[PDB]
């Protein structure tokens, strides 16, 4: 998986 | 506030 | 406030 | 996996 | 407040 | 896996 | 406040 | 595995 | 604060 | 494995 916020 | 990128 | 990249 | 904030 | 790079 | 902060 | 680099 | 901050 | 690089 | 900080 690449990337998110939290 | 909140804010930030994903 | 909440800031930052992914 | 790559990046992500938290 | 909260930053930085993934 | 690369980077990420947290 | 918080801060760097992945 | 490369980087990372934490 | 908090820095550095990974 | 190469780098990172913590």
Do not use: I, L, R
């Not at 998986?1 to 939290?6: A, D, F, L, N, P």
């Amino acid at each position: 998986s690449t990337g998110g916020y939290g």
